[PDB]
Design a protein around this ligand. Structure first.
Ligand SMILES: [Cl-]
Length: 199
């Protein structure tokens, strides 16, 4: 329960690759080179969660000029969009070791990140391209309808979209072809946005 939150160092590389493998299927993982880019080129944009000298989580980001740039892109191209002075922070992933999920860690990490981005000079907006977890249970309902499907009390039915919703995200739109290998979601990412102006 003794947690530390810090920016990554190069030495974290192998543990963060290990975290990537544990958190995502092979088709959904980013490659080792991208983990290295984040920690070498943009350490101020990433946060690592430690539990007694062991990494158990990470939240990642980069800065881009505007969300429209994400249209018609794949996840492997989006690193090329990074700009040092971009007014939009793009959250790239929230990773929590599966054995430690549903303990509020993701919640705390996202909140911290959101607060942190709100005080970065020049940053106007935060967005993320996330994805559904349970679309195969609802197929063939169109994904464009599914991503807004709320139960009777109003939380989104999809647990990954709900996570963003409960932290103040607005579901913007589908991004077809964002993840060519994500066949359960028919390649589609989901763009969400955070209004950070109150922060
Ligand atoms: Cl640059």
């Amino acid at each position: 329960n003794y947690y530390n939150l810090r920016h990554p160092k190069i030495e974290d590389l192998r543990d963060l690759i290990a975290l990537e493998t544990l958190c995502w299927s092979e088709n959904l993982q980013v490659d080792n080179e991208e983990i290295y880019r984040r920690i070498f080129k943009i350490p101020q944009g990433q946060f690592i969660l430690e539990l007694e000298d062991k990494i158990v989580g990470a939240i990642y980001s980069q800065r881009i000029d505007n969300p429209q740039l994400l249209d018609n892109k794949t996840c492997t191209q989006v690193p090329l969009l990074h700009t040092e002075s971009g007014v939009v922070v793009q959250l790239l992933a929230v990773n929590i070791l599966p054995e430690l999920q549903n303990q509020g860690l993701g919640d705390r990490l996202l909140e911290f990140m959101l607060q942190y981005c709100a005080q970065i000079s020049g940053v106007e907006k935060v967005v993320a391209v996330t994805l559904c977890r349970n679309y195969p249970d609802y197929s063939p309902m169109p994904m464009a309808e599914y991503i807004h499907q709320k139960n009777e009390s109003g939380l989104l039915v999809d647990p990954l979209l709900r996570f963003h919703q409960i932290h103040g995200a607005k579901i913007e739109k589908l991004l077809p072809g964002y993840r060519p290998k994500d066949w359960e979601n028919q390649t589609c990412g989901v763009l969400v946005s955070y209004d950070i102006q109150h922060r």
